[PDB]
């Protein structure tokens, strides 16, 4: 006759609980499937993309069970500016008798190592196959830098298409193309609205979507039926994600860099400041291993304008007091995961949308900010994400010098001015400083119809740099 909390705590103890990561693992022997890595830190990053007013927080909640805030009391229902994050752990039963489509399950971040089987009729125990994180990209036309930032942090894609609306949705196509720009061909298609459709209409939508993707780069993207209200066939989503999406090559020989996209300070209001915490920036790992008690630097830094007007970018160097990976404060960071890096920086730096799309680096490494850069770019034929009512979907216009073009370097939102244009290369001056380390693939957006529209991809070749000031 124990209460619910006692039963769940007993299952938590019997399930192994949440192990603590040892301080100094033998790094050169660990893989993302290792027990020390798979228990507390994310390994595969996946994103949800779809049209507006379709529901990406609801499907993510059904998959995982972790809600997204969608804050500011006005963005709660229309669209979101910041990232909607959630944590999912994917489990499979260790018994062969269980149904393979249904043995897959997903649970919250606070779940134990081995939860009991929730299927009535089997005494097996679940096993965490692989750890994933889910990110909610904002699907609206006014917010385009956020989607490209998500593509930069995303390594897997989840497209959402509703049924009762128009089958060839342009925003879904634009998201798919922007993800293909990010060199990501591991995409999964999902049908958002299924219940209100008939027998024939679901197949009609399936054939329409099949016709939608025949000439694009995507080849083997599966189509999955799911409903965001009944909370069913989420095991199908986890199955498809585990089977189709592999782990990108990411190991210890690569240099540590991080790409910070969000910002959340830790400052409890009303509580005495004597019990506080430093400023925390939210960023993902694309290369390198991090540890508690290191020193980081935000190289774009404080951007000051002098009397002349030149950009003085002071790197913000700081000491990492805490490393957080999706459940608890841990020590060692595996490449390919989202982490809130907390340091002793002033809380003003981590409150608002300020550290949006920037890079940070550890000591012994000097990335370079740039002012004038050279980029090799190419376009497509038709505009994506626009609705031309049956008249010749607009074709991209050629770039013009001295035009404000939003050159999103992977995730960095920079407003570049063209100083020269040739057949396939361009030169741009940046007002907001942008760093370049190795490749940092780029997307380009322009403005004609009062908004920002993606036009094509871009890759940096050279540029004039400004060495950091001490």
């Amino acid at each position: 006759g124990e209460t619910e909390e006692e039963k769940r705590k007993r299952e938590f103890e019997e399930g192994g609980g949440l192990p603590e990561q040892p301080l100094n693992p033998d790094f050169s022997k660990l893989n993302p499937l290792s027990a020390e890595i798979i228990n507390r830190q994310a390994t595969i990053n996946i994103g949800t993309i779809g049209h507006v007013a379709h529901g990406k927080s609801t499907v993510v909640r059904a998959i995982s069970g972790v809600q997204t805030v969608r804050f500011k009391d006005e963005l709660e229902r229309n669209i979101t500016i910041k990232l909607g994050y959630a944590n999912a752990k994917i489990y499979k039963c260790q018994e062969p008798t269980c149904p393979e489509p249904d043995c897959y399950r997903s649970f919250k971040s606070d779940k134990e190592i081995s939860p009991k089987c929730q299927r009535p009729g089997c005494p097996g125990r679940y096993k965490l196959v692989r750890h994933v994180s889910f990110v909610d990209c904002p699907g609206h036309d006014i917010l385009m830098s956020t989607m490209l930032s998500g593509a930069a942090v995303m390594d897997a894609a989840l497209l959402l298409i509703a049924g009762n609306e128009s089958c060839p949705q342009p925003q879904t196509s634009e998201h798919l193309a922007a993800i293909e720009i990010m060199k990501l061909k591991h995409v999964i298609i999902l049908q958002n609205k299924v219940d209100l459709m008939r027998e024939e209409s679901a197949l009609e939508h399936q054939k329409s979507i099949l016709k939608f993707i025949r000439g694009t780069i995507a080849d083997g993207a599966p189509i999955v039926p799911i409903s965001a209200q009944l909370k069913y066939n989420i095991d199908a989503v986890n199955e498809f994600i585990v089977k189709t999406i592999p782990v990108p090559p990411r190991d210890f020989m690569i240099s540590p860099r991080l790409i910070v996209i969000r910002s959340f300070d830790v400052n409890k209001p009303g509580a005495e400041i004597e019990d506080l915490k430093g400023g925390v920036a939210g960023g993902s790992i694309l290369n390198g291993v991090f540890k508690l008690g290191d020193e980081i630097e935000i190289r774009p830094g404080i951007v000051t304008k002098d009397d002349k007007g030149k950009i003085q970018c002071k790197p913000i160097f700081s000491n990492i007091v805490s490393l957080f990976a999706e459940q608890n404060d841990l020590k060692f960071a595996v490449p390919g995961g989202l982490i809130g890096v907390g340091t002793k920086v002033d809380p003003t730096l981590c409150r608002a949308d300020r550290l949006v799309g920037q890079v940070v680096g550890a000591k012994g490494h000097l990335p370079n900010i740039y002012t004038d850069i050279e980029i090799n770019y190419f376009l497509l034929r038709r505009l994506l994400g626009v609705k031309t009512d049956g008249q010749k979907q607009a074709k991209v216009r050629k770039l013009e010098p001295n035009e404000v073009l939003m050159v999103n370097i992977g995730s960095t939102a920079t407003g570049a001015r063209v100083v020269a244009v040739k057949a396939d290369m361009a030169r741009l001056q940046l007002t907001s400083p942008a760093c370049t380390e190795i490749n940092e693939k780029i997307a380009l957006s322009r403005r004609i119809e009062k908004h920002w529209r993606l036009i094509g991809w871009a890759t940096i070749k050279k540029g004039t740099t400004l060495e950091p000031i001490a």
Binding site: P101, V194, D195, E199, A202, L203, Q206, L210, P222, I223, V224, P225, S227, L230, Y232, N233, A236
Partner: peptide
Amino acid sequence: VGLPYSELLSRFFNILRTNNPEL
């Protein structure tokens, strides 16, 4: 291919028809 999508389609419609026959 999209054939193994229709199997989950049929499973899900069976689930719905079991759930709410009113609609």
